[PDB]
Amino acid sequence: PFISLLQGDQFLADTPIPGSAVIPNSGNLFPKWADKLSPTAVETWLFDAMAEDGSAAFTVSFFRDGSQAPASFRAAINAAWSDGTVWSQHLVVPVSVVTSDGPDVGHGHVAGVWRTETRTTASFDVAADLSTTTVVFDAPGRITGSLTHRSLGYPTLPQSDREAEVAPGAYWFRPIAMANATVDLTFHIDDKTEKRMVLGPEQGAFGGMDRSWLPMVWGKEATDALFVRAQAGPYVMAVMRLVSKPHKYYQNTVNAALYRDGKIVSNALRSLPPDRRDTAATADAVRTEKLYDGDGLVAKYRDKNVGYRLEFRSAGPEREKWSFDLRHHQAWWAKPTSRPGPDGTGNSGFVVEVTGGLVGSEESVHGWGMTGEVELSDGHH
């Protein structure tokens, strides 16, 4: 059984060593820095869930971040309730181990455990099938309980290095694009008060599993990082969009997908200038545009946006375009990503209300989703 075990005080490499290669048609769930972690790399395993009506939302990211050494191993957790409660905490642990069962390192049952050797355990499990996941928390006085996914089998796996990229040589994609989700969690509201979050298997709760690794930290490559997961009528959409630093001229990159009743209708690996709204389509693409007009909570940091517009394009024969407005409905989290002031930037999570549909039609669907809206400084020239 393949094992990547990082612990103690010597897990970090001395130089930024390379990570192992993209495996085509695989979840790529085994760590790319298996034995020694590069000091500028970060690996991410993301699992999330939300109510189909936006009444609850949950996300956890399991991190191995070399640049945060010694505190490199983190389970970052955010939760939101319809009544206004929000809950955000990092579980920082000294041990992160990931195993993969089977002869094929790109196609085996995977288990991750972020843990102590107070007491903290946070773990995930993914079927070799990618058919199911289980996430379990055991952190007394903070969070306990589980999340599970049952995959709906949407097409999603990258067939090449290019399809796995979210930017050149940086990777973010979705080994499970869409899943029936359950949660059964208990949170300690430290304001000993407990709060429950329960989403059962027949309530239409949904979520996905996202996988990322970057040889270089985002703080030095991006000025903008947008995450989206949303569902509206037949449509399911998921986005990770990057806008680079000025030294690369605000390169616009994305790894995104739009589905209609489970069929992928835009394999969007091209991110368009936000002020275009034309009909050109030499490839599937998505346009992400900050919205400032109309309904929605106003974000607090660099950009005072009330939401985002997502316009998907298909290069298929019918040349369809879909447009959705994702408007800030509930402020989930909000954290500075720089010192305050005129150049100040932030990291904001929202539950969003979703409207829109097929352009040129009478379609007007309605739904719910989440966004993670990250801003980073423009840097020194």
Curated annotation (Swiss-Prot):
GO MF term set = isomerase activity
Q: What does this protein do?
A: Diels-Alderase; part of the gene cluster that mediates the biosynthesis of the tetramic acid Sch210972, a potential anti-HIV fungal natural product that contains a decalin core. The PKS module of cghG together with the enoylreductase cghC catalyze the formation of the polyketide unit which is then conjugated to 4-hydroxyl-4-methyl glutamate (HMG) by the condensation domain of the cghG NRPS module.
Task: Tell me what reaction this enzyme catalyses.
Answer: (2S)-3-[(2S)-3,5-dioxo-4-[(2E,4R,6R,8E,10E,12E)-4,6,12-trimethyltetradeca-2,8,10,12-tetraenoyl]pyrrolidin-2-yl]-2-hydroxy-2-methylpropanoate = sch 210972
The entry's family comment says:
Belongs to the Diels-Alderase family.
Name of protein: Diels-Alderase cghA
Q: Does the record carry Transmembrane helix as a key word?
A: no
EC numbers, comma separated: 5.5.1.-
Its annotated pathway reads:
Secondary metabolite biosynthesis
Which UniProt keywords are given for this protein, alphabetically ordered?
Isomerase
